[PDB]
Amino acid sequence: EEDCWKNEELKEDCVGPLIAPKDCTDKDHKTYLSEASLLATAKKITQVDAENVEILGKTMESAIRVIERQKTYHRMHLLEAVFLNKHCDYYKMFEHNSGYSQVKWRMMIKTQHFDICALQANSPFCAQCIADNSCAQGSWEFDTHMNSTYSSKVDNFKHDFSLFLRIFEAAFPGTAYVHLLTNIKEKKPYQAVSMIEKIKKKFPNNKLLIGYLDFGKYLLGLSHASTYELQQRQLDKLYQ
Amino acid sequence: EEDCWKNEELKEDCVGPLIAPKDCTDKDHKTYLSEASLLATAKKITQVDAENVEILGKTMESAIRVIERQKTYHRMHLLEAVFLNKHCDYYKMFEHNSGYSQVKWRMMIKTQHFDICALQANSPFCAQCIADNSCAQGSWEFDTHMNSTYSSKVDNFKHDFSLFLRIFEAAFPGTAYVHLLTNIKEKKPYQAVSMIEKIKKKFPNNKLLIGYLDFGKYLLGLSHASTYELQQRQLDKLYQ
Amino acid sequence: EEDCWKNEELKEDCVGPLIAPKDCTDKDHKTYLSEASLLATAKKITQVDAENVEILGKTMESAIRVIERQKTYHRMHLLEAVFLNKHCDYYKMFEHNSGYSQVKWRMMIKTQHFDICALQANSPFCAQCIADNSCAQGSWEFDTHMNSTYSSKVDNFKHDFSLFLRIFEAAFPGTAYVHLLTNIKEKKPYQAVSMIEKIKKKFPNNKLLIGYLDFGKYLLGLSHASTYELQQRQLDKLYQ
Ligand SMILES: *[C@@H]1O[C@H](CO[C@@H]2O[C@@H](C)[C@@H](O)[C@@H](O)[C@@H]2O)[C@@H](O[C@@H]2O[C@H](CO)[C@@H](O)[C@H](O)[C@H]2NC(C)=O)[C@H](O)[C@H]1NC(C)=O
Ligand SMILES: *[C@@H]1O[C@H](CO[C@@H]2O[C@@H](C)[C@@H](O)[C@@H](O)[C@@H]2O)[C@@H](O[C@@H]2O[C@H](CO)[C@@H](O)[C@H](O)[C@H]2NC(C)=O)[C@H](O)[C@H]1NC(C)=O
Ligand SMILES: *[C@@H]1O[C@H](CO[C@@H]2O[C@@H](C)[C@@H](O)[C@@H](O)[C@@H]2O)[C@@H](O[C@@H]2O[C@H](CO)[C@@H](O)[C@H](O)[C@H]2NC(C)=O)[C@H](O)[C@H]1NC(C)=O
Ligand SMILES: [Cl-]
Ligand SMILES: [Cl-]
Ligand SMILES: [Cl-]
């Protein structure tokens, strides 16, 4: 298990989709400040902090912009915990194939396309999951189809890898994306995979999601992932 | 036939997509107030009302927000009739597979996905219409594929049913959505089907549309439709 | 070859996607005014013009709105050349299947659908490229499938043709769209095809793009293209 409050480091068991409540009771009644008052009575946050969560705007897109701005795990986690306690169905919706919290990433995944799916479209991910949206298959042949192709053409690994990141930040802004970026900067891509696997376990029915995630697990295994270097705005998303 | 002006109740023959003009002449010249002046000279509305349609903003998204706000059939129908007389190609575009009035719902249908299509993707709706966008088939097997699956898992009926509503309001905001919601609150889902069928008859070529509509006709037949209860904002969309 | 600066007429070798740099060095450092200062030192533009490119707003959507507003080839080309020198990866992204400069047209192509794909979906474009997104095929059967269908129903040529234009302007706003519109007004559609072919040559890997472009090359061959007449806003996009 994990104590996300005592931890001064981000650990994968503490990223947003793993720490959200599983379900909710009355979302319309709660506000950020009320749920923060509750964390204070729990002795998780101070009364000072709870009165300081007005830093999240009234709107949801704003709250997320603030959360993304944070430069420490303590602050980012506190804001995420208030946020997801007010929107308690936020990651609950990822249990299904639609939802408001999914709009950004589904749109992105169905619009921005990978280069590998263009180069050879025979692989079941491209021709079955991304197109047909089925994704009920547990069996993808990733290696047979894509290994030599990424081996040869490195800039299409660069493109597909950065695309995978853009999508991941649209799905899970905050701690989860920061954890992933961080394992990449350190030149240890595969240590993100553990988190990804735990994410898969939470949303068994989101078939598009599971497919995309398995593809990312794949890209992270490629040697080319350890040679990838981050653009300046990605580096900015990290911690001080 | 129907007299939509004498009616003090919403009837299905009077919902927006059925009452729009079939085609247009010069749309650029007309404004809301001009077409309202014409309804007044027709003795359908009073000169007072015609001078009161500035309540629709200059923009189209605003006019629709106002129309949706109305709490009576008389007012909602009056505003819809002015609106669709200014945008006289509005539902004309639904005769085809593209158009400005379609942007919201097509985007939604291709982005937000149903849970049934994830659970078993073999059914021709999922694997042929939603993915491949063909939908030229008249034959869907809905019962063989989906009956036992919705029977067992009720929360995926809940999700897919609310999704179907979100899409319907994106396609046909106003009277048509209010008529549908109302038949649902009354615990008589299948009485909406008649309207849906008339809608199908108007846009034979919009194959995505016809497919989605047939799916909704299906969901409305399930016992689970009569047990569905509406979230507060849906109830707000109804009439006083 | 072509001298795009001495030319007082728009030629196809001078449209935006053909004249963009192929790649970039440091995009974050440059602004419109800096790259315009560089064109001035090159003796391509006057110092007056370079100090006049503040007419492009700070944002990118605004710069594009201004570029589209221009009523001459000299001005439109000057603004495009500054613009694409600041965003030097703009059409570089079209070498791949994702990117910021692609968001508008991919969204449009996957959301707004053609009438032909609804009428008979057997043709490989509809059932393979638009749906499945593969598009690795060089072989489309366009004639066998679509010739008699557009022959008979003229309003679906009208719809699919205007759709093709809406998409083209989302992909290549500015000179390329103006060149295309112009060849259409003059009742010489097929003279746009040359440009389209050169565009195909620049982005071999963008399979969706190549497919859509081949479809437009097809529509431009149909007699019905020479009978098409432009709506007023299309005519407004042209030159004085
Ligand atoms: C497909 O590729 C993976 C990993 O990619 C390779 O990694 C390097 C060893 C190098 O060969 C690169 O060009 C490739 O991109 C292979 O799996 C890894 O193999 C290494 C070999 O030492 C092993 O140590 C790792 O544990 C393996 N797994 C990883 C990195 O996740 C894999 O074998 C290739 N072939 C098939 C059929 O999958
Ligand atoms: C598939 O389901 C429909 C309706 O769903 C069922 O309705 C209840 C009777 C109950 O069995 C629920 O668990 C199901 O969800 C079936 O069609 C209806 O059957 C009833 C039986 O009394 C009949 O009165 C209705 O008129 C039928 N039609 C409707 C409601 O539109 C249908 O038979 C099932 N099987 C197949 C193969 O379609
Ligand atoms: C499919 O159609 C193209 C062009 O469309 C036809 O053009 C007219 C001649 C008329 O028949 C319209 O109803 C059609 O829409 C055919 O190709 C053209 O044929 C003309 C004949 O004179 C020739 O001059 C052009 O060069 C041809 N190519 C063009 C216009 O790009 C084509 O033959 C038709 N059939 C097949 C199998 O492709
Ligand atoms: Cl979050
Ligand atoms: Cl309406
Ligand atoms: Cl441009």
Author numbering:
A (entry chain A), B (entry chain A), C (entry chain A): 478 to 717
Publication passage describing the model:
In addition to the variable region of SBV Gc, we determined the crystal structures of the Gc head domains from BUNV (aa 478–721), LACV (aa 477–722) and OROV (aa 482–702) to resolutions ranging between 2.1 Å and 2.9 Å and refined the resulting atomic models to Rfree values between 0.21 and 0.23. The head domains of BUNV, LACV, and OROV contain each a single asparagine-linked carbohydrate chain and although the positions of the respective glycosylation sites along the aa sequences are not conserved, they project from the same face of the domain carrying the two glycan chains in SBV. The buried surface area at the trimer interface amounts to 1422 Å2 and 1430 Å2 on each protomer for BUNV and LACV, respectively. Whereas the atomic details at these interfaces differ between the two viruses, they comprise mainly hydrophilic residues in the region between helices h7 and h11 at the side opposite to the glycosylated surface. The concurrent observation of two very similar trimeric assemblies in two independent crystal structures strongly suggests that the trimers are physiologically relevant. The dissociation of the trimers at low pH is likely triggered by protonation of residue H590 in BUNV and in LACV, which would lead to electrostatic repulsion with positively charged side chains on the neighboring protomer.
The OBV M segment encodes two glycoproteins, Gn and Gc, derived from a single polyprotein precursor, with Gn encoded upstream of Gc. Compared with other bunyaviruses, OBV Gn is relatively small, with an ectodomain of about 200 amino acids (aa), whereas Gc, with an ectodomain of ca. 900 aa long, is about twice the size of its Gc counterparts from other bunyaviruses. Furthermore, the head domain is well exposed to the environment and is a major target of the humoral adaptive immune system of the OBV mammalian hosts, indicating that the trigonal pyramid of the spike shields the functionally more critical membrane fusion core machinery from the host’s antibody response.
